[PDB]
Amino acid sequence: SGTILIDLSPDDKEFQSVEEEMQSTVREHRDGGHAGGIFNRYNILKIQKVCNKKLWERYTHRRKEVSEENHNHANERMLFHGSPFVNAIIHKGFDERHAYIGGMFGAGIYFAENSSKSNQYVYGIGGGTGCPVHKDRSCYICHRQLLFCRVTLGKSFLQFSKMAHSPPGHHSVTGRPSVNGLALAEYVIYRGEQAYPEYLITYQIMRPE
Ligand SMILES: CCOc1ccc(-c2nnc([C@H]3C[C@H](NC(=O)c4ccnc5cccnc45)C3)n2-c2ccccc2)nc1
Ligand SMILES: [Zn+2]
């Protein structure tokens, strides 16, 4: 595999930065919690740094290329990723060949700047049938995993809510909010090597009250 997970102590400022980013970027969703559950906060159980030399080199190699194509600017962002495939991704890396064709921006890998948006996909598109054990999308019991990832957007194409690759001259798509469309920003890459899954976050959504 080559992948090592480093457990971060809650007293570690690197843990605390990821924890804060996760808690602070929660929003109320217009679906009233249908996809990700009803919560305003998480129980952060565990944050692990993902260390894989092969995957890191794959990422930085792509990043150099994107940079030369975008006026020496990678347009690198730290973004949340949610999917059922977290375990595969930390071992084998992101893989566009596994992309689901039912996305707003076609067959790509979707990231978000709001943790609560990525949380809606941990059990599948629109939350699937919820947690495996209780078939509940708002399950407070079962533990979830998000990735907090290093993502190379390069020259990002701006769009509102049928697409295979980046537009010509572009490296990603930035989905922007619209009245008849997106509520929140999402980012899409069409090459797996434009993201590194840097931190694996184990959490529950917290029951409010
Ligand atoms: C309307 C919202 O649309 C979305 C939201 C998120 C995503 C998305 N963006 N990226 C993803 C996943 C990351 C991709 N998979 C891998 O990189 C992958 C990597 C390595 N092995 C695998 C084995 C099985 C499946 N996937 C893999 C698919 N997905 C995804 C999420 C939930 C279910 C299915 C796909 N796709 C569409
Ligand atoms: Zn459950």
Curated annotation (Swiss-Prot):
Secretion signal, residue range per the UniProt entry: none
Post-translational modification: Ubiquitinated at 'Lys-48' and 'Lys-63' by RNF146 when auto-poly-ADP-ribosylated; this leads to degradation. Deubiquitinated by USP25; leading to stabilization.
Tissues expressed in: Highly expressed in placenta, skeletal muscle, liver, brain, kidney, heart, thymus, spinal cord, lung, peripheral blood leukocytes, pancreas, lymph nodes, spleen, prostate, testis, ovary, small intestine, colon, mammary gland, breast and breast carcinoma, and in common-type meningioma. Highly expressed in fetal liver, heart and brain.
Localization (cell): Cytoplasm; Golgi apparatus membrane; Nucleus; Chromosome, Telomere
Residue numbers binding Zn(2+): C131, H134, C139, C142
Family: Belongs to the ARTD/PARP family.
Function: Poly-ADP-ribosyltransferase involved in various processes such as Wnt signaling pathway, telomere length and vesicle trafficking. Acts as an activator of the Wnt signaling pathway by mediating poly-ADP-ribosylation of AXIN1 and AXIN2, 2 key components of the beta-catenin destruction complex: poly-ADP-ribosylated target proteins are recognized by RNF146, which mediates their ubiquitination and subsequent degradation. Also mediates poly-ADP-ribosylation of BLZF1 and CASC3, followed by recruitment of RNF146 and subsequent ubiquitination.
Subunit structure: Oligomerizes and associates with TNKS. Interacts with the cytoplasmic domain of LNPEP/Otase in SLC2A4/GLUT4-vesicles. Binds to the N-terminus of Grb14 and TRF1 with its ankyrin repeat region. Interacts with HIF1AN. Interacts with RNF146; this interaction leads to ubiquitination and proteasomal degradation. Interacts with NUMA1.
The name this protein goes by in its record: Poly [ADP-ribose] polymerase tankyrase-2
Taxonomic source organism: Homo sapiens (Human)
Organism ancestry: Eukaryota, Metazoa, Chordata, Craniata, Vertebrata
